PDB file of C-alpha atoms and ligand atoms in Angstrom:
ATOM      1  CA  UNK A   1     174.938  76.556 102.848  1.00  0.00           C
ATOM      2  CA  UNK A   2     172.788  73.459 102.348  1.00  0.00           C
ATOM      3  CA  UNK A   3     175.381  70.951 101.171  1.00  0.00           C
ATOM      4  CA  UNK A   4     173.024  69.892  98.371  1.00  0.00           C
ATOM      5  CA  UNK A   5     170.118  71.855  96.810  1.00  0.00           C
ATOM      6  CA  UNK A   6     167.772  71.086  93.904  1.00  0.00           C
ATOM      7  CA  UNK A   7     165.223  73.578  92.592  1.00  0.00           C
ATOM      8  CA  UNK A   8     163.780  70.919  90.311  1.00  0.00           C
ATOM      9  CA  UNK A   9     162.267  68.949  93.169  1.00  0.00           C
ATOM     10  CA  UNK A  10     160.930  72.074  94.766  1.00  0.00           C
ATOM     11  CA  UNK A  11     158.580  72.641  91.855  1.00  0.00           C
ATOM     12  CA  UNK A  12     160.360  75.793  90.737  1.00  0.00           C
ATOM     13  CA  UNK A  13     161.888  74.392  87.557  1.00  0.00           C
ATOM     14  CA  UNK A  14     159.722  73.679  84.472  1.00  0.00           C
ATOM     15  CA  UNK A  15     160.192  70.685  82.197  1.00  0.00           C
ATOM     16  CA  UNK A  16     163.211  70.694  79.791  1.00  0.00           C
ATOM     17  CA  UNK A  17     162.801  72.762  76.576  1.00  0.00           C
ATOM     18  CA  UNK A  18     164.695  72.653  73.144  1.00  0.00           C
ATOM     19  CA  UNK A  19     165.929  75.819  71.488  1.00  0.00           C
ATOM     20  CA  UNK A  20     166.087  74.011  68.161  1.00  0.00           C
ATOM     21  CA  UNK A  21     168.407  74.609  65.231  1.00  0.00           C
ATOM     22  CA  UNK A  22     168.437  78.229  66.417  1.00  0.00           C
ATOM     23  CA  UNK A  23     171.173  80.188  68.253  1.00  0.00           C
ATOM     24  CA  UNK A  24     168.855  81.313  71.073  1.00  0.00           C
ATOM     25  CA  UNK A  25     170.656  79.863  74.086  1.00  0.00           C
ATOM     26  CA  UNK A  26     170.817  83.423  75.389  1.00  0.00           C
ATOM     27  CA  UNK A  27     167.027  83.625  75.516  1.00  0.00           C
ATOM     28  CA  UNK A  28     166.138  80.187  76.875  1.00  0.00           C
ATOM     29  CA  UNK A  29     168.591  80.504  79.762  1.00  0.00           C
ATOM     30  CA  UNK A  30     167.915  84.069  80.857  1.00  0.00           C
ATOM     31  CA  UNK A  31     164.205  83.255  80.640  1.00  0.00           C
ATOM     32  CA  UNK A  32     164.059  80.067  82.689  1.00  0.00           C
ATOM     33  CA  UNK A  33     165.734  82.040  85.468  1.00  0.00           C
ATOM     34  CA  UNK A  34     162.903  84.593  85.528  1.00  0.00           C
ATOM     35  CA  UNK A  35     160.595  81.553  85.602  1.00  0.00           C
ATOM     36  CA  UNK A  36     161.921  80.116  88.840  1.00  0.00           C
ATOM     37  CA  UNK A  37     162.298  83.418  90.667  1.00  0.00           C
ATOM     38  CA  UNK A  38     158.603  84.025  89.979  1.00  0.00           C
ATOM     39  CA  UNK A  39     158.000  80.496  91.325  1.00  0.00           C
ATOM     40  CA  UNK A  40     159.526  81.272  94.732  1.00  0.00           C
ATOM     41  CA  UNK A  41     158.210  84.660  95.808  1.00  0.00           C
ATOM     42  CA  UNK A  42     154.843  84.523  94.034  1.00  0.00           C
ATOM     43  CA  UNK A  43     154.320  80.756  94.199  1.00  0.00           C
ATOM     44  CA  UNK A  44     153.213  80.478  90.573  1.00  0.00           C
ATOM     45  CA  UNK A  45     155.143  78.300  88.088  1.00  0.00           C
ATOM     46  CA  UNK A  46     154.607  79.567  84.550  1.00  0.00           C
ATOM     47  CA  UNK A  47     156.477  78.834  81.277  1.00  0.00           C
ATOM     48  CA  UNK A  48     157.259  82.216  79.674  1.00  0.00           C
ATOM     49  CA  UNK A  49     158.052  82.869  75.983  1.00  0.00           C
ATOM     50  CA  UNK A  50     161.577  82.634  74.530  1.00  0.00           C
ATOM     51  CA  UNK A  51     159.982  83.798  71.280  1.00  0.00           C
ATOM     52  CA  UNK A  52     158.852  87.182  72.553  1.00  0.00           C
ATOM     53  CA  UNK A  53     162.580  87.610  73.174  1.00  0.00           C
ATOM     54  CA  UNK A  54     163.859  86.596  69.755  1.00  0.00           C
ATOM     55  CA  UNK A  55     161.232  88.888  68.208  1.00  0.00           C
ATOM     56  CA  UNK A  56     161.583  91.878  70.487  1.00  0.00           C
ATOM     57  CA  UNK A  57     165.053  92.027  72.005  1.00  0.00           C
ATOM     58  CA  UNK A  58     166.240  93.793  68.873  1.00  0.00           C
ATOM     59  CA  UNK A  59     169.330  94.750  70.865  1.00  0.00           C
ATOM     60  CA  UNK A  60     170.261  91.114  70.436  1.00  0.00           C
ATOM     61  CA  UNK A  61     170.207  88.807  67.420  1.00  0.00           C
ATOM     62  CA  UNK A  62     167.367  86.307  67.498  1.00  0.00           C
ATOM     63  CA  UNK A  63     168.850  83.049  66.289  1.00  0.00           C
ATOM     64  CA  UNK A  64     172.463  84.087  65.907  1.00  0.00           C
ATOM     65  CA  UNK A  65     173.947  85.362  69.134  1.00  0.00           C
ATOM     66  CA  UNK A  66     172.959  87.002  72.387  1.00  0.00           C
ATOM     67  CA  UNK A  67     174.144  88.198  75.790  1.00  0.00           C
ATOM     68  CA  UNK A  68     172.697  88.175  79.281  1.00  0.00           C
ATOM     69  CA  UNK A  69     173.279  91.840  80.132  1.00  0.00           C
ATOM     70  CA  UNK A  70     170.751  92.755  77.441  1.00  0.00           C
ATOM     71  CA  UNK A  71     168.050  90.090  77.632  1.00  0.00           C
ATOM     72  CA  UNK A  72     167.387  91.009  81.228  1.00  0.00           C
ATOM     73  CA  UNK A  73     167.188  94.791  80.758  1.00  0.00           C
ATOM     74  CA  UNK A  74     164.808  94.168  77.910  1.00  0.00           C
ATOM     75  CA  UNK A  75     162.381  92.276  80.195  1.00  0.00           C
ATOM     76  CA  UNK A  76     162.449  94.990  82.875  1.00  0.00           C
ATOM     77  CA  UNK A  77     162.355  98.117  80.771  1.00  0.00           C
ATOM     78  CA  UNK A  78     159.365  96.604  78.936  1.00  0.00           C
ATOM     79  CA  UNK A  79     157.113  95.817  81.886  1.00  0.00           C
ATOM     80  CA  UNK A  80     157.544  92.081  81.554  1.00  0.00           C
ATOM     81  CA  UNK A  81     157.494  88.896  79.482  1.00  0.00           C
ATOM     82  CA  UNK A  82     154.601  86.856  78.040  1.00  0.00           C
ATOM     83  CA  UNK A  83     153.964  83.151  78.550  1.00  0.00           C
ATOM     84  CA  UNK A  84     154.821  80.304  76.193  1.00  0.00           C
ATOM     85  CA  UNK A  85     151.205  79.282  75.487  1.00  0.00           C
ATOM     86  CA  UNK A  86     150.406  82.796  74.312  1.00  0.00           C
ATOM     87  CA  UNK A  87     153.672  83.372  72.524  1.00  0.00           C
ATOM     88  CA  UNK A  88     154.656  79.837  71.383  1.00  0.00           C
ATOM     89  CA  UNK A  89     158.001  78.967  69.950  1.00  0.00           C
ATOM     90  CA  UNK A  90     158.644  78.926  66.210  1.00  0.00           C
ATOM     91  CA  UNK A  91     162.464  78.461  66.132  1.00  0.00           C
ATOM     92  CA  UNK A  92     163.168  81.621  64.202  1.00  0.00           C
ATOM     93  CA  UNK A  93     162.979  85.410  64.534  1.00  0.00           C
ATOM     94  CA  UNK A  94     160.164  87.642  63.246  1.00  0.00           C
ATOM     95  CA  UNK A  95     157.960  90.724  64.003  1.00  0.00           C
ATOM     96  CA  UNK A  96     157.282  91.657  67.634  1.00  0.00           C
ATOM     97  CA  UNK A  97     153.610  91.256  68.658  1.00  0.00           C
ATOM     98  CA  UNK A  98     151.162  92.848  71.162  1.00  0.00           C
ATOM     99  CA  UNK A  99     151.963  90.469  73.981  1.00  0.00           C
ATOM    100  CA  UNK A 100     151.036  90.966  77.624  1.00  0.00           C
ATOM    101  CA  UNK A 101     153.192  91.327  80.693  1.00  0.00           C
ATOM    102  CA  UNK A 102     152.504  88.250  82.782  1.00  0.00           C
ATOM    103  CA  UNK A 103     155.746  88.405  84.772  1.00  0.00           C
ATOM    104  CA  UNK A 104     158.722  90.656  85.395  1.00  0.00           C
ATOM    105  CA  UNK A 105     161.541  91.595  87.743  1.00  0.00           C
ATOM    106  CA  UNK A 106     163.169  94.607  89.368  1.00  0.00           C
ATOM    107  CA  UNK A 107     166.581  93.993  87.846  1.00  0.00           C
ATOM    108  CA  UNK A 108     169.372  91.440  87.736  1.00  0.00           C
ATOM    109  CA  UNK A 109     172.554  91.052  89.741  1.00  0.00           C
ATOM    110  CA  UNK A 110     175.917  89.617  88.718  1.00  0.00           C
ATOM    111  CA  UNK A 111     177.854  87.159  90.841  1.00  0.00           C
ATOM    112  CA  UNK A 112     181.559  87.631  91.687  1.00  0.00           C
ATOM    113  CA  UNK A 113     183.553  86.503  88.650  1.00  0.00           C
ATOM    114  CA  UNK A 114     185.694  83.356  88.715  1.00  0.00           C
ATOM    115  CA  UNK A 115     184.476  82.678  92.240  1.00  0.00           C
ATOM    116  CA  UNK A 116     182.503  79.458  92.632  1.00  0.00           C
ATOM    117  CA  UNK A 117     182.618  79.428  96.407  1.00  0.00           C
ATOM    118  CA  UNK A 118     180.153  82.374  96.332  1.00  0.00           C
ATOM    119  CA  UNK A 119     178.402  81.295  93.120  1.00  0.00           C
ATOM    120  CA  UNK A 120     177.176  78.378  95.188  1.00  0.00           C
ATOM    121  CA  UNK A 121     175.599  81.149  97.238  1.00  0.00           C
ATOM    122  CA  UNK A 122     173.460  82.635  94.488  1.00  0.00           C
ATOM    123  CA  UNK A 123     172.591  79.152  93.143  1.00  0.00           C
ATOM    124  CA  UNK A 124     171.632  78.341  96.753  1.00  0.00           C
ATOM    125  CA  UNK A 125     169.151  81.207  96.720  1.00  0.00           C
ATOM    126  CA  UNK A 126     167.880  80.873  93.139  1.00  0.00           C
ATOM    127  CA  UNK A 127     168.863  79.510  89.693  1.00  0.00           C
ATOM    128  CA  UNK A 128     171.700  81.616  88.162  1.00  0.00           C
ATOM    129  CA  UNK A 129     172.318  81.775  84.427  1.00  0.00           C
ATOM    130  CA  UNK A 130     175.873  81.178  83.234  1.00  0.00           C
ATOM    131  CA  UNK A 131     177.950  80.913  80.081  1.00  0.00           C
ATOM    132  CA  UNK A 132     180.281  78.066  79.088  1.00  0.00           C
ATOM    133  CA  UNK A 133     182.384  76.594  76.272  1.00  0.00           C
ATOM    134  CA  UNK A 134     179.741  74.181  74.937  1.00  0.00           C
ATOM    135  CA  UNK A 135     181.506  73.355  71.610  1.00  0.00           C
ATOM    136  CA  UNK A 136     183.810  70.510  72.681  1.00  0.00           C
ATOM    137  CA  UNK A 137     183.061  66.969  71.488  1.00  0.00           C
ATOM    138  CA  UNK A 138     182.809  65.373  74.927  1.00  0.00           C
ATOM    139  CA  UNK A 139     180.702  68.224  76.115  1.00  0.00           C
ATOM    140  CA  UNK A 140     178.377  68.092  73.104  1.00  0.00           C
ATOM    141  CA  UNK A 141     178.566  64.307  73.436  1.00  0.00           C
ATOM    142  CA  UNK A 142     177.968  64.066  77.134  1.00  0.00           C
ATOM    143  CA  UNK A 143     175.263  61.724  78.286  1.00  0.00           C
ATOM    144  CA  UNK A 144     175.476  60.448  81.832  1.00  0.00           C
ATOM    145  CA  UNK A 145     177.631  60.557  84.935  1.00  0.00           C
ATOM    146  CA  UNK A 146     179.453  63.632  86.254  1.00  0.00           C
ATOM    147  CA  UNK A 147     181.137  65.518  83.403  1.00  0.00           C
ATOM    148  CA  UNK A 148     184.771  66.361  83.984  1.00  0.00           C
ATOM    149  CA  UNK A 149     185.837  66.152  80.317  1.00  0.00           C
ATOM    150  CA  UNK A 150     187.722  68.522  77.975  1.00  0.00           C
ATOM    151  CA  UNK A 151     186.778  72.153  77.297  1.00  0.00           C
ATOM    152  CA  UNK A 152     188.635  75.428  77.334  1.00  0.00           C
ATOM    153  CA  UNK A 153     186.918  78.477  78.823  1.00  0.00           C
ATOM    154  CA  UNK A 154     185.861  81.132  76.323  1.00  0.00           C
ATOM    155  CA  UNK A 155     182.115  80.924  76.788  1.00  0.00           C
ATOM    156  CA  UNK A 156     179.779  80.372  73.805  1.00  0.00           C
ATOM    157  CA  UNK A 157     176.627  78.898  75.350  1.00  0.00           C
ATOM    158  CA  UNK A 158     174.186  79.982  78.044  1.00  0.00           C
ATOM    159  CA  UNK A 159     172.388  77.802  80.584  1.00  0.00           C
ATOM    160  CA  UNK A 160     170.978  77.649  84.112  1.00  0.00           C
ATOM    161  CA  UNK A 161     172.533  76.290  87.307  1.00  0.00           C
ATOM    162  CA  UNK A 162     169.560  74.909  89.180  1.00  0.00           C
ATOM    163  CA  UNK A 163     171.449  73.058  91.894  1.00  0.00           C
ATOM    164  CA  UNK A 164     174.686  71.502  93.083  1.00  0.00           C
ATOM    165  CA  UNK A 165     176.542  68.970  95.206  1.00  0.00           C
ATOM    166  CA  UNK A 166     179.699  68.195  97.199  1.00  0.00           C
ATOM    167  CA  UNK A 167     181.671  68.205  93.957  1.00  0.00           C
ATOM    168  CA  UNK A 168     179.419  68.984  91.008  1.00  0.00           C
ATOM    169  CA  UNK A 169     176.808  71.276  89.489  1.00  0.00           C
ATOM    170  CA  UNK A 170     173.289  70.665  88.153  1.00  0.00           C
ATOM    171  CA  UNK A 171     173.344  72.581  84.882  1.00  0.00           C
ATOM    172  CA  UNK A 172     170.225  73.247  82.819  1.00  0.00           C
ATOM    173  CA  UNK A 173     170.695  73.211  79.032  1.00  0.00           C
ATOM    174  CA  UNK A 174     168.082  73.580  76.275  1.00  0.00           C
ATOM    175  CA  UNK A 175     168.574  70.727  73.817  1.00  0.00           C
ATOM    176  CA  UNK A 176     165.591  68.492  74.607  1.00  0.00           C
ATOM    177  CA  UNK A 177     165.175  65.639  77.097  1.00  0.00           C
ATOM    178  CA  UNK A 178     167.243  63.392  74.834  1.00  0.00           C
ATOM    179  CA  UNK A 179     170.523  65.127  75.652  1.00  0.00           C
ATOM    180  CA  UNK A 180     172.709  64.431  78.651  1.00  0.00           C
ATOM    181  CA  UNK A 181     170.817  63.334  81.744  1.00  0.00           C
ATOM    182  CA  UNK A 182     167.172  63.963  80.716  1.00  0.00           C
ATOM    183  CA  UNK A 183     168.088  67.356  79.310  1.00  0.00           C
ATOM    184  CA  UNK A 184     170.465  68.144  82.138  1.00  0.00           C
ATOM    185  CA  UNK A 185     174.198  67.798  82.714  1.00  0.00           C
ATOM    186  CA  UNK A 186     176.057  67.565  86.023  1.00  0.00           C
ATOM    187  CA  UNK A 187     179.316  69.513  85.819  1.00  0.00           C
ATOM    188  CA  UNK A 188     181.998  69.076  88.464  1.00  0.00           C
ATOM    189  CA  UNK A 189     182.478  71.891  91.009  1.00  0.00           C
ATOM    190  CA  UNK A 190     185.497  74.057  91.730  1.00  0.00           C
ATOM    191  CA  UNK A 191     188.566  74.607  89.510  1.00  0.00           C
ATOM    192  CA  UNK A 192     189.277  78.368  89.395  1.00  0.00           C
ATOM    193  CA  UNK A 193     187.285  80.164  86.716  1.00  0.00           C
ATOM    194  CA  UNK A 194     185.267  76.938  86.555  1.00  0.00           C
ATOM    195  CA  UNK A 195     184.800  73.870  84.314  1.00  0.00           C
ATOM    196  CA  UNK A 196     184.333  75.202  80.746  1.00  0.00           C
ATOM    197  CA  UNK A 197     184.661  78.547  82.548  1.00  0.00           C
ATOM    198  CA  UNK A 198     181.336  78.208  84.413  1.00  0.00           C
ATOM    199  CA  UNK A 199     182.194  80.905  86.959  1.00  0.00           C
ATOM    200  CA  UNK A 200     183.215  83.567  84.475  1.00  0.00           C
ATOM    201  CA  UNK A 201     179.888  85.268  83.723  1.00  0.00           C
ATOM    202  CA  UNK A 202     177.298  84.430  86.426  1.00  0.00           C
ATOM    203  CA  UNK A 203     173.959  86.223  86.681  1.00  0.00           C
ATOM    204  CA  UNK A 204     170.413  85.936  88.041  1.00  0.00           C
ATOM    205  CA  UNK A 205     167.162  88.033  88.012  1.00  0.00           C
ATOM    206  CA  UNK A 206     165.852  89.627  91.210  1.00  0.00           C
ATOM    207  CA  UNK A 207     162.323  90.404  92.461  1.00  0.00           C
ATOM    208  CA  UNK A 208     160.411  92.438  95.078  1.00  0.00           C
ATOM    209  CA  UNK A 209     157.739  91.546  97.696  1.00  0.00           C
TER     210      UNK A 209
HETATM  211  C1  E64 Y 301     177.501  83.771  76.955  1.00  0.00           C
HETATM  212  C2  E64 Y 301     176.477  83.022  76.123  1.00  0.00           C
HETATM  213  C3  E64 Y 301     175.171  83.795  76.045  1.00  0.00           C
HETATM  214  C4  E64 Y 301     177.052  82.790  74.724  1.00  0.00           C
HETATM  215  C5  E64 Y 301     176.436  83.530  73.533  1.00  0.00           C
HETATM  216  N1  E64 Y 301     175.845  82.572  72.611  1.00  0.00           N
HETATM  217  C6  E64 Y 301     174.644  82.726  72.055  1.00  0.00           C
HETATM  218  O1  E64 Y 301     173.878  83.674  72.285  1.00  0.00           O
HETATM  219  C7  E64 Y 301     174.266  81.610  71.101  1.00  0.00           C
HETATM  220  O2  E64 Y 301     174.939  81.579  69.838  1.00  0.00           O
HETATM  221  C8  E64 Y 301     173.981  80.339  71.902  1.00  0.00           C
HETATM  222  C9  E64 Y 301     173.428  79.229  71.056  1.00  0.00           C
HETATM  223  O3  E64 Y 301     174.023  78.076  71.164  1.00  0.00           O
HETATM  224  O4  E64 Y 301     172.469  79.417  70.314  1.00  0.00           O
HETATM  225  C10 E64 Y 301     177.516  84.343  72.817  1.00  0.00           C
HETATM  226  O5  E64 Y 301     178.561  84.661  73.396  1.00  0.00           O
HETATM  227  N2  E64 Y 301     177.252  84.678  71.559  1.00  0.00           N
HETATM  228  C11 E64 Y 301     178.061  85.603  70.777  1.00  0.00           C
HETATM  229  C12 E64 Y 301     177.241  86.383  69.770  1.00  0.00           C
HETATM  230  C13 E64 Y 301     177.759  86.163  68.349  1.00  0.00           C
HETATM  231  C14 E64 Y 301     179.285  86.053  68.305  1.00  0.00           C
HETATM  232  N3  E64 Y 301     179.756  85.161  67.244  1.00  0.00           N
HETATM  233  C15 E64 Y 301     180.336  85.582  66.118  1.00  0.00           C
HETATM  234  N4  E64 Y 301     179.964  86.812  65.767  1.00  0.00           N
HETATM  235  N5  E64 Y 301     181.206  84.912  65.353  1.00  0.00           N
END
């Protein structure tokens, strides 16, 4: 595949976000993926609402927990998601409004587990959301350079792989521009089930046209 690919320079990836003192990693991640797939086939780059998710994906748990195989189905079975402007962020759950369906997808497809060689495939076609063990000190206290550091698998956080390189990943978090490398964190590539288990639960939204 292309040795090195970045969806941030292609104009597919929106600026960094900030989930806030709220356990909504599961929403931010799974949502920024549906943002870049819609900015690839359609050609439009919109910032959808992570709040319509905390307020409507009842299946999940707003600010305290969430999974990918349930944030996606929500967005499809409902006709779509609403933008951020319309449905701004509040940093906490609440009722579920009369929002519109500005975007949507046909489904979602999972990538072969603990297989990074082919995860580089999906991430080479479009941003793929993943889960990791983002509770370690070095992880939580990463700033620059390529993060090798300590962390045992057993995922707890969700993010978006927006690119990669000869030996590292370009992970997209959701803790503001003041964390890691301007909101992002480059995680080394290859290892088995991945660094902080990166290749354990891969996933990305699909689309027609
Ligand atoms: C794979 C990714 C999506 C991890 C996921 N984490 C979350 O949804 C959030 O808590 C993420 C966050 O940092 O806000 C997760 O596994 N959450 C578990 C749900 C609650 C389990 N915890 C309990 N019940 N002690």
